[PDB]
């Protein structure tokens, strides 16, 4: 009658493997931990890596109370939906209209439709951490019954650049200026080589407005076959523009909803210099769930559940749990440039 | 014996799956509701979406008499045709000549011919809503015994662009001007990236007249195999021209007829910037039909009926009922440019 | 004894399924009527097409005495040959000479040779109607004891174009001029999109002579595998040149024999813009025939017969009867250009 | 004893399948006549077929006395070879001494080589008529006791062009002149389309010399299976390099000998614009052999014979009889111009 955590994990395989842009490109390692806290010493490498977690008071990061730690408990994300068979279901190919009126068949379809919405809600929380770690080397962590704190990965000052004092590309003459030298100087602050630049819509329009960029950029398709197939199913909000020399140009127009407001993952005039082989870690803390522990599921990135509430009245619901801790092993691998 | 709703839904699957261009590309999600009202709050992914429905008096939209809502009862389309045995059947290949004389074999094909003409009549209504929603973020909804109203889903003023005052492509130099800058500038108003542009015939003739487009457009077959597969059976009115950079170029020449007057879906000199992964919703209100309810068919996008009329038992008719409400989850995913 | 109509229909099925070019590509629907008269209102989707029939006197069309009609009785084509065992038989592969001495074997073989030639005579009449319907939107109908009339399908004047006043491709610079812009301008007159162009030999050589065409035309085999399959067995008079972007280029050098004189289907310097998904109808009036009525064959496109002339000194013959009426549902789907 | 007609046919099973190229490509219809005269009226599809026969004396054609005829007696050829002598054998590898002891095997091998040589010699007479039919539209045939005459099939003069002035490919500048426009202009004189051109080592080397030919040719095998099947049957080989757009480029290495001269099939290559679906007829006047009429062989393309005469031991011989008359239904389907 109730889907077990193992049954839901096997059904959500396709939706879980679908990763947003920044997670898919720069976070290619996953480390579920059997303990509630995440111990960075147990990850291969990263012997001296620490996380300076600072508590947030009054919406302002209070760094004086913060301290460096290699052990941390991530906040718990618990998207849940009540199971109502009378709710609308997305029509699937070759569905039987008479089955779609069976309340038992609609309950089966509602649970998996809820598993889709709950999965991408957790994937949004992971991508918010993913893009903020690349943009700033730090992000704000929230969670259920969790006081929001800032997780800092220790990015150098030189890796966060803002164009000012005449270096604004908007004030440069688009006809005769070549942004190559500026990008070369930005890329030197990166720990490794830079072979990809992720723009926002506005920053890309400014970047491509230069005549030297139009003449140099290879817009033809197949310029980077490895990257084009990695971003193929992300065409809704990701655009591969081409190769700018040995650097691949990508535009990220993704959005996330937070407190009922649509926000952009990338602020206006954003230019992120990075490496496709950068090391990002998807570490997950263990969520002690009685149903999961009884099924032998100790460490997992997702804890799907299909159960009823104990209180009266008994209402069936679905839920997926996760304790994500998206981290960059080397935050200086990226050079985040705020264009102006 | 009269054909039931479940049987006709089974035979119409081949014709019903044939979707017109805009419905097929941008409206890839169907949501039939179990109630007469369509509730936007139970559609996955929508966070407090509302429409503005204004009454239309004498062909004029009166927005002062309109109001916002998240629930709406769509107008019912009911294409009905009397089963006329005098209709000449299309001779099928390898068709047995003894079957041609059987009146039961003929009435089956005559009903299927009615089901075909009735399905494309509803598909024209849905495609009209779909095309007008992509062009203006709103459309006029009709229906059987239904006063016309304007269903507005809200498009920003910046996503509707008209070339004038020196920016019209017809007055540009076809040998030196590069429309690439205009497309990139127009694409900034989209919520996500742009990977497809749908032209009308005249807008395509103007766009490809530029020599910079002839040198850049990749017209080779297989340049965008996924899009070519989707528009393959639409060769009568849809033409895939190729890849213009990272953006595919499609020409839509579909047209409907009213009182013998041929009318195109897309106006003259129309350029629609959009995304192949854009989220359009095919919502349907439940049509409470006694025959459908008895067969356990509650929610459906089509309600085919084969019944006899009440005035004269000698008259037998067929009918397909539907309550379409084509909506765009984000009308700003598209940028409708009126070329000049 | 005498071969029945059903036996003759089964033997001639392969020869009947073999269609000339314009019938095979543009007239993919057949509608045999059980009544001697063809009723346009009984055909699905012919609300927007009207027939204007004018009489012909001294080979000159008189439109002033012509009028519209929704009902039509086509002329009767009745190719007949007498069966004489003196005819020389085509030596088939693996044929047995012991059968050649059998009088019944030679009788069957000669009847089949007559059925082949008689089918070609009717297929020529249909292709004549098909070619002229595509070229002009009208054709001249003949028949036994049938006064010739012009069947006009009401093509717009904009869809018949003649190059004149500097527009002639022959007066253009073959080294620098691009005929693409002219073709795109011509295609704007079509109801839908244009994905096929049918040239005559002379008009193709003029279109081939431009250097911009030699660089743009993809002549590789397999460029349009579905169209190459359709014209594979027509290699005598049909040549597939390749894909001109998204438009297939076909050359038609077919000839029809009228009054013992071979005549080309297409006039010199002919360029026909069209669509492979265009709706062409092969309507056939009923022919009351005793041998066809014996098998319950009321409506048919062919009426084969093997009978002996009663009242005359022992004359055995064969005959196939037909009342063809080829129609274009929308003659504006084609743009017929008379090059110069 | 003497070998049955079926016994030599089982030996000439695969040997009669092999056929010279021009007969294999353009003469797929065999019409063996039961009368000594051939009657072109008794062949289906021939629209008033006539042959202009002219008597030839002292090596010159007198067309003043000739007249168009529909009937014609083909000259009969009967190559014969004596059987069962002690003549020096033919060298064939992988032959053991076990077959040197049986005198019947050597006699058996003598019949096969004679049947092959006689079947070849008649096949050469037909190819002389065939090659000359598509090259000149007229030919002179020989006979056992026949009076030589010219057989003119009415080839149009326009299909027999002669290069003069600047049309010579040697006078034209190499790599500055495209042979396409010549081949397309010469093809306008053909009745249908041209999908094959025949070459030879001398003229194909001139055609492959142009740089523009190298890129447009498809050297990969599998382009035309029927064409590659003909190149494989010949051990000494007769090859074609591949497709040339829609036209096939074939090279013929076969040669013949007429009387005492070793005149070639065609000088250099000229231009052989042909169609693989062109209609050519293999018309055979019947040869009256008493043993053939006794076996029921009234009309046949080949009259094979294995009989014995007189002597002690009696003289044995083999003979294949045929009265071939190779004709082109439409000689204007080919264009032959003198090329240098």
Residue length of chain D: 340
| Cα–Cα dist B287/B297, whole Å | 10
State which residue of chain C sits closest to B236, comparing Cα positions. Answer: C277
| Cα–Cα dist D28/A79, whole Å | 76
Token pair 């969670």: residue: A143
Distance between B263 CA and the closest CA of chain A, angstroms: 31
Residue C21 φ then ψ, to 5° = -55, -65
Instruction: With CB atoms and an 8 Å threshold, state whether C277 touches B235.
Output: yes
Helix axes A201-208, B180-187, angle to 10 degrees: 160
Say if residue C107 is exposed, middle or buried (CB neighbours under 10 Å; 0-12, 13-18, 19+): middle
Structure tokens belonging to residue C265: 């289907």
Cβ pair B270, B336 in contact under 8 A: yes
| Cα–Cα dist C153/C133, whole Å | 8
Structure tokens belonging to residue C266: 């297409």
State which residue of chain A sits closest to B14, comparing Cα positions. Answer: A94
Q: Is the dihedral of CA A212, A213, A218, A224 positive or negative?
A: positive
Q: Distances in Å between the alpha carbon of A305 and those of A5, A9, A111, A118, B25?
A: 6, 9, 10, 11, 35
Provide CB contacts within 8 A for D114, sequence distance 6+: D81, D83, D318
Helices (H) and strands (E) in chain D, counts: 9, 18
| Cα–Cα dist D45/B314, whole Å | 55
Of B194, B275, B296, the CB nearest to A101: B296
Q: Is the dihedral of CA A189, A192, A193, A198 positive or negative?
A: negative
Provide CB contacts within 8 A for A252, sequence distance 6+: A21, A22, A131, A198, A199, A200, A237, A238, A265, A266
Angle among Cα A66, A69, A70 to the nearest 5 degrees reads 160
Of C205, C239, C253, the CB nearest to D185: C205
| Cα–Cα dist A149/A65, whole Å | 11
Helix axes C201-209, D179-187, angle to 10 degrees: 170
Secondary structure (3-state) at D13: helix
Residue A141 φ then ψ, to 5° = -105, 130
- Determine which helix (DSSP H) or strand (DSSP E) holds B321, and give its type and residue range: strand B316-321
**Does residue B205 belong to the interface with chain C, where contact is any CB pair within 8 Å?**
yes
Say if residue C166 is exposed, middle or buried (CB neighbours under 10 Å; 0-12, 13-18, 19+): exposed
Cα-to-chain-centroid distance, residue D12: 18
Structure tokens belonging to residue D175: 């790599």
**Does residue B6 belong to the interface with chain A, where contact is any CB pair within 8 Å?**
yes
Question: What are the E-state strand segments in D85-147?
Answer: 138-141
Cβ pair B71, B140 in contact under 8 A: no
- Determine which helix (DSSP H) or strand (DSSP E) holds C326, and give its type and residue range: strand C324-328
Selection from A340, A287, A306, A243 nearest residue A143 by Cα: A287
| Cα–Cα dist D328/D133, whole Å | 7
Structure tokens belonging to residue A85: 């068979």
| Cα–Cα dist D30/B79, whole Å | 60
Instruction: With CB atoms and an 8 Å threshold, state whether B242 touches C243.
Output: no
Residues of chain B contacting A100 with CB distance shorter than 8 Å: 32, 298-300
**Does residue A211 belong to the interface with chain B, where contact is any CB pair within 8 Å?**
no
Selection from B240, B324, B309, B270 nearest residue B30 by Cα: B324
Structure tokens belonging to residue C186: 């011509």
The region, left, alpha or beta by phi > 0 then psi within -120 to 50, assigned to residue B143 is left
| Cα–Cα dist A237/A263, whole Å | 13
**Does residue D198 belong to the interface with chain C, where contact is any CB pair within 8 Å?**
no
Residues of chain D contacting C115 with CB distance shorter than 8 Å: none
Token pair 């006043």: residue: C165
Residue length of chain B: 340
**What single-letter DSSP state applies at residue B200?**
P
Q: Distances in Å between the alpha carbon of C38 and those of A287, B43, C75, C278, C317?
A: 77, 52, 11, 21, 29
Q: Provide the CATH topology of domain B157-278+332-338.
A: capsid protein of prophage fold (3.30.1930)
| Cα–Cα dist A131/A133, whole Å | 5
Instruction: With CB atoms and an 8 Å threshold, state whether B190 touches A253.
Output: yes
State which residue of chain C sits closest to B204, comparing Cα positions. Answer: C184
Cβ pair C320, C145 in contact under 8 A: no
Cα-to-chain-centroid distance, residue B91: 30
Sheet containing A80-82: order of strands:
A80-82, A316-321, A303-308
Secondary structure (3-state) at D232: helix
Secondary structure (3-state) at A227: helix
Residue length of chain C: 340
Of B43, B47, B190, the CB nearest to A257: B47
Selection from D31, D62, D34 nearest residue D327 by Cα: D31
| Cα–Cα dist C319/B54, whole Å | 69
β-partners of residue D68 are: D52
Chains near C with 3+ CB pairs less than 8 A apart are B, D
Instruction: With CB atoms and an 8 Å threshold, state whether D195 touches C97.
Output: no
Resolution at which this structure was determined, Å: 2.7
Provide CB contacts within 8 A for D324, sequence distance 6+: D74, D77, D122, D125, D126, D129, D282, D283, D284, D301
Distance between B306 CA and the closest CA of chain C, angstroms: 19
DSSP annotation string for A97-109: TTGGG-HHHHHHH
Of A102, A202, A255, the CB nearest to B191: A255
Cβ pair D195, D164 in contact under 8 A: no
Name the H helices within chain B: 5-11, 13-17, 21-26, 97-101, 103-136, 180-187, 201-207, 211-216, 225-230, 290-294
Residues of chain B contacting C192 with CB distance shorter than 8 Å: 236-237, 253-255
């Amino acid at each position: 009658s109730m889907y077990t955590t193992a049954q839901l994990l096997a059904a959500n395989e396709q939706k879980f493997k679908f990763d947003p842009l920044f997670l898919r490109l720069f976070f290619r390692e996953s480390y579920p931990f059997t303990t509630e806290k995440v111990y960075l010493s147990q990850i291969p490498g990263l012997v001296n890596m620490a996380l300076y977690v600072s508590p947030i008071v009054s919406g302002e990061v209070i760094r004086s109370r913060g301290g460096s730690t290699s052990e941390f408990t991530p906040g718990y994300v618990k998207p849940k939906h009540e199971v109502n068979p009378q709710m609308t279901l997305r029509r699937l190919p070759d569905e039987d209209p008479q089955n779609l009126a069976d309340p038992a068949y609609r309950r089966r379809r509602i649970i998996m439709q809820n598993m889709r919405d709950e999965e991408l809600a957790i994937a949004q929380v992971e991508e918010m951490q993913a893009v903020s770690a690349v943009l700033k080397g730090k992000y704000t962590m929230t969670g259920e019954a969790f006081d929001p704190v800032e997780v800092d990965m220790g990015r150098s000052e030189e890796n966060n650049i803002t164009q000012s004092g005449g270096t604004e590309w908007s004030k440069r003459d688009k006809s005769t200026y070549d942004p190559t030298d500026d990008i070369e100087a930005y890329a030197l602050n990166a720990s490794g080589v830079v072979n990809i630049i992720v723009f926002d819509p506005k920053g890309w329009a400014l970047f491509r407005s230069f005549k030297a960029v139009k003449e140099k950029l290879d817009t033809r398709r197949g310029s980077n076959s490895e990257l084009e197939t990695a971003v193929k199913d992300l065409g809704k909000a990701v655009s591969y523009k081409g190769m700018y020399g040995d650097v691949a140009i990508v535009v990220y127009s993704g959005q996330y909803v937070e407190n009922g407001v649509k926000k952009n993952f990338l602020p206006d005039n954003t230019m992120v210099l990075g490496n496709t082989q950068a090391r990002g870690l998807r570490t997950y803390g263990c969520i002690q769930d009685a149903d999961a522990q009884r099924e032998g599921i100790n460490a997992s990135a997702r804890y799907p559940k299909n159960a009823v509430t104990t209180g009266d009245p008994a209402r069936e619901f679905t839920m997926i749990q996760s304790a994500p801790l998206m981290l960059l092993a080397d935050p200086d691998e990226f050079v985040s440039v705020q264009l102006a």
